[PDB]
Design a protein around this ligand. Structure first.
Ligand SMILES: *[C@H](C)[C@H]1/C(=C/c2[nH]c(/C=C3N=C(/C=C4\NC(=O)C(CC)=C4C)C(C)=C\3CCC(=O)O)c(CCC(=O)O)c2C)NC(=O)[C@@H]1C
Ligand SMILES: *[C@H](C)[C@H]1/C(=C/c2[nH]c(/C=C3N=C(/C=C4\NC(=O)C(CC)=C4C)C(C)=C\3CCC(=O)O)c(CCC(=O)O)c2C)NC(=O)[C@@H]1C
Ligand SMILES: *[C@H](C)[C@H]1/C(=C/c2[nH]c(/C=C3N=C(/C=C4\NC(=O)C(CC)=C4C)C(C)=C\3CCC(=O)O)c(CCC(=O)O)c2C)NC(=O)[C@@H]1C
Ligand SMILES: *[C@H](C)[C@H]1/C(=C/c2[nH]c(/C=C3N=C(/C=C4\NC(=O)C(CC)=C4C)C(C)=C\3CCC(=O)O)c(CCC(=O)O)c2C)NC(=O)[C@@H]1C
Ligand SMILES: *[C@H](C)[C@H]1/C(=C/c2[nH]c(/C=C3N=C(/C=C4\NC(=O)C(CC)=C4C)C(C)=C\3CCC(=O)O)c(CCC(=O)O)c2C)NC(=O)[C@@H]1C
Ligand SMILES: *[C@H](C)[C@H]1/C(=C/c2[nH]c(/C=C3N=C(/C=C4\NC(=O)C(CC)=C4C)C(C)=C\3CCC(=O)O)c(CCC(=O)O)c2C)NC(=O)[C@@H]1C
Ligand SMILES: CCC1=C(C)/C(=C/C2=NC(=C\c3[nH]c(/C=C4\NC(=O)[C@H](C)[C@H]4CC)c(C)c3CCC(=O)O)/C(CCC(=O)O)=C2C)NC1=O
Ligand SMILES: CCC1=C(C)/C(=C/C2=NC(=C\c3[nH]c(/C=C4\NC(=O)[C@H](C)[C@H]4CC)c(C)c3CCC(=O)O)/C(CCC(=O)O)=C2C)NC1=O
Ligand SMILES: CCC1=C(C)/C(=C/C2=NC(=C\c3[nH]c(/C=C4\NC(=O)[C@H](C)[C@H]4CC)c(C)c3CCC(=O)O)/C(CCC(=O)O)=C2C)NC1=O
Ligand SMILES: CCC1=C(C)/C(=C/C2=NC(=C\c3[nH]c(/C=C4\NC(=O)[C@H](C)[C@H]4CC)c(C)c3CCC(=O)O)/C(CCC(=O)O)=C2C)NC1=O
Ligand SMILES: CCC1=C(C)/C(=C/C2=NC(=C\c3[nH]c(/C=C4\NC(=O)[C@H](C)[C@H]4CC)c(C)c3CCC(=O)O)/C(CCC(=O)O)=C2C)NC1=O
Ligand SMILES: CCC1=C(C)/C(=C/C2=NC(=C\c3[nH]c(/C=C4\NC(=O)[C@H](C)[C@H]4CC)c(C)c3CCC(=O)O)/C(CCC(=O)O)=C2C)NC1=O
Ligand SMILES: CCC1=C(C)/C(=C/C2=NC(=C\c3[nH]c(/C=C4\NC(=O)[C@H](C)[C@H]4CC)c(C)c3CCC(=O)O)/C(CCC(=O)O)=C2C)NC1=O
Ligand SMILES: CCC1=C(C)/C(=C/C2=NC(=C\c3[nH]c(/C=C4\NC(=O)[C@H](C)[C@H]4CC)c(C)c3CCC(=O)O)/C(CCC(=O)O)=C2C)NC1=O
Lengths: 172, 197, 289, 162, 162, 172, 172
């Protein structure tokens, strides 16, 4: 996998060049963003089970065809699979937020998830709706101003929204 | 690296040819080569858990959820699932950290190759494989071993091999009996302050 | 075009072979060569005996009473074509056969199978055959005077699924469509319903692992969902498609063809175990990123 | 039993290599977090008795049926209340252990591992311990660096039980 | 490659869990040391040509026999000197990559893995590159945390070669 | 897996016939050539590292695109893999020379080699050029008059050249 | 395994109470000591190969019967095994210095090493002598005042010395 440092290191190694000064200033800017990034990771990690449960509950309330008898989230095994699918997608969104690059989310989460969901008959649109529900829950928790120092945090929120967009796009 | 120091094989039941019909005291083949129901896949995963972690570490915290999900989708073979069980954090902390390299080699040979160690010399020979290549290098050596393959291959849960001979009530002691740690870690836990009354 | 893999994939005897077109004032050997090209393409390289040679349609083509397009239509309406391809096959197999014969390419999407099967059941086989012949693609590719031919090369308006499914249909120059590993089974039902693509396995002779066909169930998927995580320390993952494992035996080997996802670090060992086994590697595809 | 230092050593042992600059940075972060972790553990050690008593009272307030109906798993008698106070004291003590150690390792080897069969065999609701740890989150009294470190372990036990 | 962040994610993900406080202070140590690492990479980028030329001259001074006698593996002619300067530039560039990334991951997946068969097949003495890296240790000109990070990557390449 | 006798055995058994006198005399001529075959195997084995190193040096002097950064042979891991592939191809060419039949070469080395090289992005024409450089070095070393008793060795050397050409054609 | 924090945590849990105030102050003093601990770990890691090489040279120069023909350090496999043994022991000494506790050293490296060396015929007294020479080299490079800010490191030096003494006592 790659993070925000080894991405430009790998590009510099393939180009055979050193890191230019603008790349070093961009990496220093990511270092300055890093404390806010750690807070975002901590908040989604702390409220991960609530995010997964509330997003699943909203998804099954909006789409009762999943939980109906004969549905795709019907019975215990398929429901446990759906709940751990939300758990894994949220976990890899936090991983991509932590690294500052989507490479862990691209490779170790979404590489073949659409084809798997098509092969099993899993509705990828419902998974995308659940990913959007985890988007709105996690972004509401990260943007909560209580119990944390103030500051501009729109960039890490936009990065998390982009990771959630990537998770929702790669399932349907 | 270095070649493994030579160790002599000690006669065990798995060395000779098995003149038996499988019958009662055969270890059931848990294989993915036939297409399985999700229930049968669950019993195969539980059999792999029972082989690697024993019955005691079949708890929910020790379940490898993503590894199970990838194994259901046939992203990995049974051998790769056994590797992921051996590379699991729970296995490393519960079994590897509470043992030295010698007893962990004995544990991994029993729970992956399905046979006991021949002597202390085999434990000595593979303990330096642990000490240089890490636990992943050692597990990989054991899982790429021709023994592991000619016995279980890629798509069969490992099992104790030839534990009991035909028409015998009792045979060799089962691999389940071996504890996470020996008497040294027992008395070290006693010395740190546990287990007293 | 296809240059390096042309010898492996069988494209090269069609790369040096030009399309056969009947001139408006054509010679007799030109009509005979159009006859031979139509019997090779539309009847899919089946051996044609003299009893089933369709002398009437040949005679109508030889004096220009029918065109090459009408000759292709006539030999596709014929009972010989129907007993070769229609009467003993699934309707998806018939549809992909008519796509390979009349249009020289594999069916692209599920909607083509939908259209042709609905039109067949609504209006029969001849109406369906006429729909392949009276298609805009047929006129912009062959028209009235050119024999249909296999179109491996990229054209305007094609799909890249059709390139892989073409070699799912085309199994070599020394090969007929009736003489392939799936004897009557359609090769694109699971490729068009799921909109998936299997890896291209070349024909015999050039490719040692030519005989890999996937099972109907219990197949390893193409992309590694998970990446390096079940394998510990790894960088890239590769799906290896392995053919004809028979060295241990039935208890050990249940299936001759095996597809597995293995890392870089296990690649040498995997290759070595295939060699020791006597297996043949069909294709190796990068499964991770 | 994972800390930054034990995870760093076990990782470098897993590749069988010496400790690179990555492991030294891991220990640097452990050092910069450890003073706030020890201060939070000391403050919870001072407030432990009142925190366990208030957490037990909040659990009985949200779940009055534990104090009303009979049963072995309920706190209707003094034995059940003593077991519940002992359980919440175990939770708070292992949270202070996580604060001292600098990771979820004391929770993962002392309380989290096997807690589902604890709650399933003896018919204990995980929501009781969720409410107790939510009171501990609400009234631990820590601020800033030690607050976010302590709430990380408290929320980790929430996500394990829920 | 091997960084604090990728080891933290790979650890928490082979463990199959969310990023706990341990991986968070792994990131904290990465942020604590990363600015000094980027400044060290900037300084080595600024002085790279002079450092590579001086390291090559130090190799030709301590090991003069690479200059007189012939052979493909020596720097007697112009192209051998060019490939020696290219090798030392590779070494210094991967040292800058390690200072950017915060670990010896660029060294491992770019230089350390496989260098033994490099030195054995083409008959390159590792002591030449050892002396080149000791010259880079002598005159990189960094101080403080930038110096100890840079010296750790150089000595990691020393310990692999020696 | 076959050698020079085992191939004739397999062909005769597939025809279900005893070996004719021409086949027995051809195998007797092969037994007569066997000492020169052992000499060729011994010379390539004894100079294998020199062949691999000199062929790699000639290949990367002719193709400096591989060793420049952004190239396939760049970095010590990929170059170590490249030299390992050079000595592996040389090892199985010596195995084929030893057996007198290319079954070990096409079954145990070139099985899936082109698929591996294409999936890795390894330039197969560059590996073919290195195989040709090993061919030139090996047919130089085997045809050296000094240190060995003289004789005609056209057939074994042509067989070695055929092994090297089918190694280069299996990666191109 | 344990570290300096988890040893205290495990003792407090096994006794069954919270950490005392003075125990937390001792751990805070360890935290303040940690920067010099990390400096010592970095120096031992940076000169580990020099420590192993120089200590092995001094060990086989002080006593020559190990490298004599028929000796234990004789033969290239056994010589590489002895150098690797010293490499491993120094590595776990570095690990125990890093954790602040000898749990990784005692559990992973020293548990059962004496009987293993007895069964192999490896002289444990010579291994202890080599461990003492690595102690001398490591305490020489840790207490080197050049290139670092000045300060008292007596407890870190004593801790590394105690780790080396219990490594030497576990084989003798
Ligand atoms: C009844 C005894 C008490 C009660 C029940 C209650 N259950 C749910 C929600 C779910 N129940 C299930 C169970 C299954 N699903 C299955 O497919 C199978 C196997 C066939 C089982 C056993 C599931 C999956 C859900 C959640 C998804 C869903 O809503 O369908 C709720 C709702 C919880 C919510 O948050 O929306 C309730 C209330 N509640 C009581 O008070 C009774 C004592
Ligand atoms: C919940 C939002 C929806 C849903 C989900 C559902 N998923 C599955 C099965 C699988 N999901 C995965 C995905 C992953 N496994 C991994 O390891 C990773 C990354 C580490 C991912 C992304 C996989 C592999 C499977 C198959 C293996 C398995 O079963 O665990 C199911 C089960 C389908 C079945 O019948 O077998 C379900 C129900 N279903 C819904 O309806 C929601 C829209
Ligand atoms: C009706 C009781 C059930 C049902 C049917 C359904 N079928 C399809 C699609 C196809 N069916 C076929 C079957 C055949 N192809 C042949 O050649 C032959 C014999 C000559 C047969 C019997 C095929 C090929 C298709 C694909 C083409 C198409 O899509 O029309 C569908 C639509 C597929 C889709 O889901 O998009 C449906 C709905 N569906 C039911 O619920 C009933 C149980
Ligand atoms: C018998 C009438 C015909 C025949 C058979 C033949 N078969 C093989 C080899 C194999 N057969 C299998 C079949 C199975 N795999 C499974 O999982 C199952 C069900 C559980 C079956 C039935 C397999 C896997 C092999 C290869 C492994 C092995 O050797 O056992 C051979 C040997 C071919 C060879 O050695 O390469 C033969 C001859 N041959 C005939 O001519 C009859 C028409
Ligand atoms: C309190 C919030 C509520 C309550 C609690 C209650 N708990 C038990 C019994 C047990 N609790 C545990 C928990 C742990 N043991 C551990 O070692 C650890 C980690 C350090 C934990 C978290 C266990 C093991 C038991 C059973 C064994 C025992 O009795 O000690 C009971 C008694 C159940 C019984 O049947 O005897 C009760 C009542 N009950 C309430 O009503 C509160 C809301
Ligand atoms: C001679 C061609 C050049 C030379 C040699 C030199 N060698 C050493 C030291 C060692 N050599 C070995 C080699 C072996 N030991 C074995 O057991 C076997 C197999 C039987 C072999 C091949 C070893 C182990 C050592 C080190 C241990 C020891 O001192 O015995 C040295 C000394 C190095 C030192 O630092 O003390 C030297 C000088 N030196 C030259 O200049 C010649 C060109
Ligand atoms: C191990 C557990 C742990 C964590 C996770 C942690 C995070 C952490 N977040 C910080 C800052 C911060 N965190 C934020 C984040 C935000 N501000 C907002 O208003 C948004 C709601 C939100 C985005 C989610 C900001 C803006 C800062 C100050 C800027 C900065 O330090 O980068 C700081 C600097 C010290 C401080 O001022 O508090 C730390 C140490 N410290 C710890 O010990
Ligand atoms: C199938 C036959 C069979 C059995 C039954 C068996 C028992 C058994 N009990 C174990 C642990 C244990 N066994 C117990 C049981 C108890 N502890 C107590 O205080 C009570 C007196 C008692 C409950 C009745 C406990 C607590 C452990 C955990 C030890 C540990 O992991 O530290 C272990 C080691 C756990 C492991 O390796 O992961 C085994 C093998 N082994 C076998 O082969
Ligand atoms: C509609 C969408 C679509 C796509 C994308 C497509 C890709 C495509 N690229 C091809 C060939 C090719 N593509 C390349 C490309 C490259 N070679 C290199 O070295 C570079 C890395 C690279 C340029 C970036 C080459 C060289 C060939 C010819 C291969 C051959 O000669 O056999 C072919 C073979 C068929 C033909 O060329 O006629 C297809 C089908 N076909 C489609 O229908
Ligand atoms: C590229 C040039 C080319 C080749 C090489 C070629 C081979 C070829 N041989 C075929 C059939 C056949 N080949 C044979 C041959 C034999 N049966 C035996 O028992 C003997 C051992 C052997 C004769 C010596 C038979 C019997 C069939 C018909 C099989 C059938 O229809 O059932 C078919 C099937 C289509 C057809 O029947 O026309 C092809 C394509 N076709 C070609 O266009
Ligand atoms: C990015 C990781 C990486 C490294 C480290 C690397 C090293 C490397 N150095 C090489 C050669 C070489 N290196 C030298 C170096 C020297 N000769 C001397 O006399 C000096 C004392 C000394 C310099 C310190 C020479 C002379 C060669 C040429 C060897 C030959 O052509 O035979 C080669 C052989 C291939 C080639 O000619 O390029 C490699 C692969 N390559 C890599 O991809
Ligand atoms: C069964 C017998 C066998 C074969 C046939 C084999 C080939 C083989 N070559 C490989 C890699 C490789 N091979 C090369 C080779 C080259 N790169 C170039 O630029 C040159 C043209 C060329 C040498 C002349 C390189 C660079 C890699 C590594 C590619 C990478 O790391 O991405 C790999 C990937 C796994 C690994 O690196 O170990 C395999 C399996 N391994 C075996 O065990
Ligand atoms: C175990 C190591 C070993 C080996 C390998 C070996 C080989 C060997 N090669 C021989 C002959 C020979 N070797 C050659 C080979 C050649 N002549 C040439 O001028 C070409 C340069 C070259 C082809 C590479 C020839 C022509 C003979 C004599 C004819 C024959 O004996 O077959 C002989 C016969 C005895 C003799 O006259 O020397 C032996 C024993 N003997 C051993 O003990
Ligand atoms: C990632 C690589 C890296 C490392 C390892 C590192 C260590 C490091 N050691 C420090 C201090 C120090 N290091 C020592 C150590 C010693 N003083 C002595 O005279 C003895 C010879 C020796 C014991 C071995 C002392 C006394 C201090 C100052 C007190 C302290 O900061 O704890 C400091 C504080 C900043 C400074 O004043 O330099 C750092 C950052 N920084 C980095 O970036």
């Amino acid at each position: 996998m790659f993070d925000v440092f080894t991405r430009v290191v790998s590009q510099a190694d393939a180009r055979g060049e050193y890191l230019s000064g603008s790349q070093l200033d961009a990496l220093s800017a990511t270092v300055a963003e890093g404390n806010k990034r750690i807070d975002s990771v901590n908040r989604i990690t702390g409220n991960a089970s609530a995010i997964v449960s509330n997003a699943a509950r909203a998804l099954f309330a909006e789409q009762p065809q999943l939980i109906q008898p004969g549905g795709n989230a019907y019975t215990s095994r398929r429901m446990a699979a759906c709940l751990r699918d939300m758990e894994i997608i949220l976990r890899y969104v936090t991983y991509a937020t932590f690294t500052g690059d989507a490479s862990v989310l691209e490779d170790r989460c979404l590489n073949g998830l659409r084809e798997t969901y098509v092969a099993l008959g899993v509705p990828g649109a419902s998974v995308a709706a659940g990913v959007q529900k985890m988007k709105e829950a996690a972004l509401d928790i990260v943007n909560d101003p209580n119990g944390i120092t103030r500051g501009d945090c729109s960039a890490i929120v936009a990065e998390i929204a982009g990771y959630f967009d990537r998770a929702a796009a790669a399932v349907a | 690296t270095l070649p493994l120091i030579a160790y002599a094989p000690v006669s065990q039941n798995q060395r000779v040819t098995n003149y038996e019909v499988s019958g009662d005291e055969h270890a059931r083949i848990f294989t993915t080569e036939g297409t399985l129901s999700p229930s049968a896949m669950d019993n195969l995963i539980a059999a792999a858990y029972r082989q690697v972690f024993n019955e005691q570490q079949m708890i929910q915290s020790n379940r490898q959820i993503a590894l199970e999900s990838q194994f259901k989708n046939q992203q990995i073979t049974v051998r790769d699932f056994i590797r992921g069980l051996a590379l699991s954090d729970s296995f490393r902390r519960r079994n590897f950290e509470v043992n030295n390299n010698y007893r962990f080699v004995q544990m991994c040979i029993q729970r992956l190759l399905g046979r006991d160690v021949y002597s202390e010399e085999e434990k000595i020979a593979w303990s330096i494989v642990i000490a240089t290549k890490g636990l992943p290098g050692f597990i990989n050596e054991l899982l790429n071993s021709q023994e592991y393959l000619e016995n279980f291959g890629y798509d069969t849960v490992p099992y104790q091999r030839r534990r009991i001979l035909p028409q015998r009530i009792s045979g060799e002691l089962p691999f389940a009996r071996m504890p996470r740690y020996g008497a040294d870690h027992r008395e070290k836990l006693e010395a740190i302050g546990y287990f007293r009354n | 075009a296809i240059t390096t893999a042309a010898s492996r994939l069988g494209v090269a005897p069609y790369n040096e072979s030009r399309p056969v077109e009947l001139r408006p004032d054509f010679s007799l050997d030109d009509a005979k060569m159009v006859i031979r090209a139509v019997y090779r393409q539309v009847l899919g390289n089946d051996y044609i005996m003299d009893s089933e040679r369709l002398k009437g349609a040949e005679s109508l083509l030889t004096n220009g009473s029918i065109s090459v397009r009408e000759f292709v239509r006539t030999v596709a309406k014929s009972e010989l074509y129907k007993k070769k391809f229609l009467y003993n096959n699934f309707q998806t197999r018939v549809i992909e056969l008519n796509y390979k014969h009349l249009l020289g390419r594999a069916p692209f999407s599920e909607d083509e199978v939908i259209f042709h099967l609905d039109l067949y059941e609504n209006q029969g086989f001849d109406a369906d055959i006429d729909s392949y012949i009276d298609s805009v693609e047929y006129q912009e590719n062959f028209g009235e005077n050119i024999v249909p031919y296999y179109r491996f090369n990229n054209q305007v308006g094609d799909r890249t699924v059709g390139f892989t499914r073409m070699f799912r249909l085309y199994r070599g120059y020394a090969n007929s469509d009736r003489s392939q590993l799936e004897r009557s089974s359609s090769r694109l039902a699971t490729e068009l319903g799921q909109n998936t693509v299997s890896a291209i396995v070349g024909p015999s002779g050039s490719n040692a692992g030519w005989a890999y066909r996937p099972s109907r169930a219990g197949n390893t998927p193409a992309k590694a969902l998970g990446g390096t995580v079940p394998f510990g320390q790894a960088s890239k993952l590769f799906r290896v498609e392995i053919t004809a494992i028979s060295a241990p035996g039935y208890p050990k080997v249940r299936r001759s063809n095996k597809a597995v996802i293995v890392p870089f670090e296990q690649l040498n060992q995997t290759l070595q175990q295939i060699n020791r086994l006597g297996g043949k590697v069909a294709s190796i595809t990068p499964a991770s990123l | 039993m994972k800390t930054p230092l034990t995870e760093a050593v076990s990782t470098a042992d897993s590749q069988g290599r010496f400790l690179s600059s990555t492991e030294l940075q891991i220990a640097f972060g452990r050092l910069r977090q450890a003073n706030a972790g020890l201060q939070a553990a000391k403050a919870l050690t001072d407030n432990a008795q009142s925190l366990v008593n208030g957490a037990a009272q909040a659990v009985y307030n949200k779940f009055p049926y534990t104090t009303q109906t009979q049963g072995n798993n309920f706190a209707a008698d003094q034995r059940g209340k003593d077991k519940c106070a002992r359980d919440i004291g175990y939770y708070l003590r292992i949270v202070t252990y996580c604060l001292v150690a600098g990771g979820t390792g004391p929770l993962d080897e002392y309380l989290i591992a096997g807690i589902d069969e604890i709650n399933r065999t003896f018919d204990l609701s995980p929501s009781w311990y969720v409410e107790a740890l939510k009171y501990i989150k609400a009234n631990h009294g820590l601020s800033g660096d030690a607050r976010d470190e302590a709430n990380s372990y408290l929320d980790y036990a929430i996500n394990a039980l829920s």
